[PDB]
Protein: 3C-like proteinase
Amino acid sequence: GFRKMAFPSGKVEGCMVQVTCGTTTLNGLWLDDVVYCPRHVICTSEDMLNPNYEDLLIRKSNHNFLVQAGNVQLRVIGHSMQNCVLKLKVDTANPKTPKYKFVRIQPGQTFSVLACYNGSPSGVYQCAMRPNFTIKGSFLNGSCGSVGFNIDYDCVSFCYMHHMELPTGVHAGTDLEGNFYGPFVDRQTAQAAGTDTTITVNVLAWLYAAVINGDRWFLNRFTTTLNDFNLVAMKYNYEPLTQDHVDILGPLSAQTGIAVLDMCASLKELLQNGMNGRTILGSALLEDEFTPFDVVRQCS
Amino acid sequence: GFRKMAFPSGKVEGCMVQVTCGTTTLNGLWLDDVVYCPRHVICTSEDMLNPNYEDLLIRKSNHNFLVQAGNVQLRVIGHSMQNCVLKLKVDTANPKTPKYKFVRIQPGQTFSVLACYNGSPSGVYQCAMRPNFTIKGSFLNGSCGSVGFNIDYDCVSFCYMHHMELPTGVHAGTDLEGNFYGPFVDRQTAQAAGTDTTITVNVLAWLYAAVINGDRWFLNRFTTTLNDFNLVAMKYNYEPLTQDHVDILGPLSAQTGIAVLDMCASLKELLQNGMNGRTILGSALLEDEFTPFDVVRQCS
Structure:
């Protein structure tokens, strides 16, 4: 097994609060004197079918928002919307605010989620942004407004806020400026995701992890061109590999002595032949939710 | 996919420190005015081959231990050993000490590890104590003294401290009173683990998780007796299921409407027939490192 490792969550735990509007409670993020949360908190069950968020927000007063940090009520002094994120101004700057920035991540990148229930931290796990801008896998039952982040040197980079579940069970959300990842809207109407694809560069990073962890059976004596690899990739719904992706795998290639295009030849054979009942890192399936950075972080 | 979720790590992050003795640096745990760490910190490479820990410890002065919390040196005022754990008394009580207890967990139970490098928190993941008292899977390269824990209501229950790697790549460690889990010793000599077994009650919890997450193909119209199930289990290196284990699965059985012995009949068929190229929760292998409590924590 190659373990998913989340970032330590302490810096984000001190920012989680509960936001209630009417009968709806979800998670908010308290940074300086602003609480961020999904704007759908202001919607009734009926409102969600076709909301006019500007009109709904105008009809709300500050006293219609109950913000609780532990057992402590924060007074709201201002409410506004930035795209799909509600910003509640409160009268107290969070004394536990970390150094932070707001970033918008790329498809295929990973991040940690602090899964919260009604403002209370419950668990932490590592998630990948799928190429179709959904988040796949199992989630904490009832967890709206939970946030995704990376820790850079001292700095928390917030990249994601959970808004929506698609009937398939996958999650959709926004960056912390309230822009959805992918084609989704915060309305209860028919929404399809695009076809998903396998994140090739992550599969290669995970094969490097396998090698570093002594799982080598799939290495073959062959090489390929980027062009010949990509013809096979396309047939198996893999993303095309670019020179920039090859360059990202440089450190794992140096650590293992296996040229990227040699690992590409190994992956081509695995796609064409299958595993013949064998496992890699205890899996019968190739894994694509570890980035090259995730592997180097854990393995170097 | 059914996600491994770790406990939020913030309460433990504030306790991690670096301990150095000569050229050896590893992790320590700073609770009130005591730093806990593996006693093998006092050993040279040569000492590890056959250490007399009492003699080695007598030859150490307080000034031979360098304890750093961030960039901050703590003065050691006392050194003693409890079984395989070194206790450094320091002149400052940790102001970030959480409510805590020390527990000794059972084989098959899970816990979160805050993986640290030279006192610095790096990542958090969920681990299971194998029936042979090893910890399996991939680990942070260089991480000695990292601790395992559960969070109970407000209270951190520390259960594990990493000491050793076995040549197979698995980890061995102690409880926080310095007693090894399993037959292992903190000496560089030939040590075998017992044969490992599959944690049956955890496989059943994970099949309940599958059902709750809409993966139902393996459910069959059959039941079994505990006795007839156990005859099959024994052949596939599964732990025998006891009435006490059946009772632990009550809540998942109630949530799904599937009797425990009906899920046992489903598992008997999976062991005898295999998966025929199908997956459960995105896995081709049955997973045994989620406890019934882990599933209820995430799914209820």
